[PDB]
Amino acid sequence: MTAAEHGLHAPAYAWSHNGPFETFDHASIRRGYQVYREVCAACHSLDRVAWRTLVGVSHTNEEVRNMAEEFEYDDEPDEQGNPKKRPGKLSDYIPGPYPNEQAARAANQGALPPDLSLIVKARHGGCDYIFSLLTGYPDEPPAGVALPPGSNYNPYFPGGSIAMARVLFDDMVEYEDGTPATTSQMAKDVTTFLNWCAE
Amino acid sequence: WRTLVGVSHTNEEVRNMAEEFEYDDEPDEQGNPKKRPGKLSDYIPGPYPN
Amino acid sequence: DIELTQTPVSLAASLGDRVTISCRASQDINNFLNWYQQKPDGTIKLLIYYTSRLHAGVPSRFSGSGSGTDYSLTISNLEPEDIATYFCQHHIKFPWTFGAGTKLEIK
Amino acid sequence: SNIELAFSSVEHIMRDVHNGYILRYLHANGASFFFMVMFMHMAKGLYYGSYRSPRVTLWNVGVIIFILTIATAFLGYCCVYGQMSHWGATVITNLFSAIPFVGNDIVSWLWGGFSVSNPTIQRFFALHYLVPFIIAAMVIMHLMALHIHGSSNPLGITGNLDRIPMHSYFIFKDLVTVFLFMLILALFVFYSPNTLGHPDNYIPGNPLVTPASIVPEWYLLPFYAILRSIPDKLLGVITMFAAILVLLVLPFTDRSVVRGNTFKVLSKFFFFIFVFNFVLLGQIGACHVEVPYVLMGQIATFIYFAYFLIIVPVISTIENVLFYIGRVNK
Amino acid sequence: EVKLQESGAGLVQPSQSLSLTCSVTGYSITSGYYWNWIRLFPGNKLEWVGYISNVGDNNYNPSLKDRLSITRDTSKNQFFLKLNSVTTEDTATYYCARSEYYSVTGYAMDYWGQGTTVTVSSAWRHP
Amino acid sequence: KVEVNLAAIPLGKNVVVKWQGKPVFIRHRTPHEIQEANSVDMSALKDPQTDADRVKDPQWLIMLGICTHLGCVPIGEAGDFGGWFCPCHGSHYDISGRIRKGPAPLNLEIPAYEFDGDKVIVG
Amino acid sequence: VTDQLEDLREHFKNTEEGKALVHHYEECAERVKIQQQQPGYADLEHKEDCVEEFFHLQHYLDTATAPRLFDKLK
């Protein structure tokens, strides 16, 4: 197997949750949720994560209740059998951006953005791979590489040709706590949030 | 629908009966919902949605 | 025997432009028409088949289209050099027959 | 077990069930440990000549248990319904399509349809629940066979002159390894629970896409390599099953007059050649079908079979003679 | 790669027989498709002579059917052309060609031999 | 039965669609690919079959994406023969879907199908 | 405040090893740029690319920036 086909090996970053006695950094998880909401959520679902699980991990009960209510969910039909909607509650699962796979692909030139609830456990490399991918888009592909129309070059992705373009750029998000929102900081925070979503 | 075949009606008769009703089909390439006529594999539809 | 009539019957043209040859069969051939290229040195290659299908190695500038009894072979430009005779043949029924030909030259 | 609910129900166990992740990681890592210990149990038997008379029946029942355990583990893996589950289910059930004439019918029967689908997963779970009970009954049969002759020992000679009761001595000696086993299993379950698994199984099964990264469960790798070594469908399947069944020829190919390898130089050497050859077979299985792995796998496959059919009988015969001429003189 | 190599006497005397051979390599004559013979007259106009299918069946242009005999040799993977009682009318450059066949697109001669100029003359040539 | 819009499929592009639980491969073959498909000697094939006996329209390769060895789905535009590669035990298929190397005994199966305007119905 | 990973990567592209690696990639890039200008480049089937050279460079950078990056982040 050629290097390109395998994908560049993701290096080992010093995640603060690495190590037998280490917990996740919950401030990083909290910040990572914001990155997910403002950037990733437009194309990525988080179907296996229930609103209530964020409580006591990265947000207060009140904060999650307010976030859940910003969305609409199907309620039980009224006394006449007509369909009706209701605001979200703690028991609901975080809603995805698309109603179905067809819509998802139509919004991404035929490609389907995978659910990210388990992405950290579903990829060799875990946090290192996710982080390296998000921060590994060069401005241009290496010489001699013909990139299929609609594709983007990223050495860490097997084959080098990925349907997702670089989405993280400096200061695109305004961190509630004052942390400078650099590309690597956002990648670090969102990856930590995604590791918590998976585990 | 298929169970009526060879019991009370012919394949042709049941197919015509099934096609008089509309059932949910897979959404189109845009993700928009769409309908289709019933087939032998479908179950006889009820008068109420809920 | 079906007979095809090519036109213009061997007419020259300039390199800085396009050209459009045509074939007309004495009968309905139903798109079963191919185009061949006979280079000056004698070598003959297949250019187009089934009215519009391009053969391997032929430049995307070669079009070719039609139906019923009238067909064509449209080119985008003669650059670098496509100077040779173009023949058309139907294969709807046996025996197969070819056209008169159309020798393309420079002005 | 419904194909549309299976993967999510395991996630429900991981997320919603109190201590569910502990149950799941214990069950998954437990299966790997079951195989590592079983490999060691079988290897001990091989080394000490445990398969030799009067324990042939004990050995044969053990081979049956090995087959049932592999089958059980396969059925369980299918229940997760991840990407490896769907494709492992597809490939393994397809092994039967190699049976001439009726092969395709057997596969369609196992599937309960056109392909691995709802009928398949639901029956696999029902069967996964059943086989462990059949294994328990075979273990009882294994113990009955062991009981009439007792255990052998590292010297390979009679143990009738000096016995000690199981109680206290071996009850407490077994406890030492029980705690060591639990300690190591806990390290994996709590600190590195997915190391022995495949990331692709965290991706729901998709009937239209077989991932390029597909790899069998580690304990199946040596057998997978043996199958891959044969460039023919039928012979590959036959050879792979033969790799398990060849264990049954050992009581007959071991020509030695003494039981076990403790006092045998050449046998000890070749036993370790066999052990590392098995590990190599597993490593080859984890590699792509490329040069020079193909040839290496074919040679290691030959060595695997040669051990039972050629090396053991030839070496054991040489050693019998060596023991004779090395002392007797005339 | 597929190659059609033509050979044979490119000079025959009137009333005699024209024998041409087409040596095919890189593709078996019995595998499939049609193996043709076509001619290009001096006035620069093509005419389909006939063929021999991969099964061994013939199909001759009725304009020559009574004179030609297209045969083949499986062992050598080559087909032949035989035109009886030649006339100056038969003077032309002869070509052998493989004709593909797909149910939707029909026939198409994709591979062509280099061609052999045959002259029906009374002239003598050292054989 | 299942319908697919051929007009939406560009030149050198592969499309996979479900039919009776199995994936159906559809490729809009380029002129170069078509020549490659019909220019291989049968002697080099364990399951000898012409490209014409496998496709109705040389431009449209339609077949079941089920490896004939043990049922895996071969990966498109991969392998050493310009076609498909099965990652399960290493079978290689060419641009016509014929088996070229590996344990698989037969070429990828061609399902019954018919053309209708700018679409094809498989079944 | 610019990206911390970008800063670290720029720093290491300047070390002796970093410069040799960029040089090797740049040399491959130029060679490829020339091959493309040649007639009939679209028909070669053996077109060289610089993925391997780029990988050597990136691997070196990753080996140096990976253990240092997080100390710079929050």
Ligand SMILES: CCCCCCCCCCCCCCCCCC(=O)OC[C@H](COP(=O)(O)OCCN)OC(=O)CCCCCCCCCCCCC
């Ligand atoms: C179908 C399946 C076929 C069977 C598959 C075979 C399974 C592969 C083997 C599994 C691993 C277990 C290793 C083998 C176990 C050793 C067996 C044994 O009984 O060894 C006894 C031996 C020394 O004992 P003695 O009694 O002869 O000492 C004389 C004292 N006077 O003890 C020794 O000499 C020391 C033991 C050295 C351990 C070797 C470990 C290497 C294992 C590699 C595993 C790593 C995998 C990634």
Ligand code: HEM
């Ligand atoms: C920082 C927010 C985001 C994160 C964390 C993220 C993460 C990921 C990850 C980990 C993958 C999987 C790659 C693999 O298969 O190994 C992926 C794929 C993909 N993402 Fe995102 N993504 C984000 C935002 C976006 C956005 C905003 C879009 C839509 C504009 C998008 C579109 C896609 C697509 C189309 C794919 C499929 C790539 C392929 O398989 O070729 N992503 N993303």
Ligand code: HEM
């Ligand atoms: C669920 C699996 C199994 C269980 C619970 C089991 C249990 C036992 C127990 C309790 C003993 C006596 C103590 C010991 O020597 O370890 C024994 C002995 C033995 N077992 Fe097993 N066994 C299993 C599988 C196997 C397999 C797979 C084989 C062979 C293929 C096998 C072959 C033997 C033999 C030959 C002995 C005699 C060892 C000697 O005394 O020299 N067993 N087994």
Ligand SMILES: C/C=C(C)/C=C/C=C/[C@H](OC)[C@@H](C)[C@@H](OC)[C@@H](C)CCc1oc2c(O)c(OC)cc(OC)c2c(=O)c1C
């Ligand atoms: C209803 C119950 C049924 C049908 C039971 C069937 C049991 C069959 C056998 O057990 C006795 C069988 C599991 C055993 O063969 C001796 C194993 C060594 C088979 C090893 C095995 O695994 C693979 C695997 O795991 C995969 O994962 C994704 C993928 C695989 O290819 C890509 C394989 C594979 O190619 C082989 C040979």
Ligand SMILES: OC[C@H]1O[C@@](CO)(O[C@H]2O[C@H](CO)[C@@H](O)[C@H](O)[C@H]2O)[C@@H](O)[C@@H]1O
């Ligand atoms: O589909 C994305 C589209 O963007 C382009 C613009 O030139 O690609 C450039 O930007 C991508 C975004 O990170 C890079 O991945 C890519 O390597 C770069 O050339 C198009 O080429 C591409 O189709």
Ligand code: FES
């Ligand atoms: S299943 Fe494709 S090679 Fe075995």
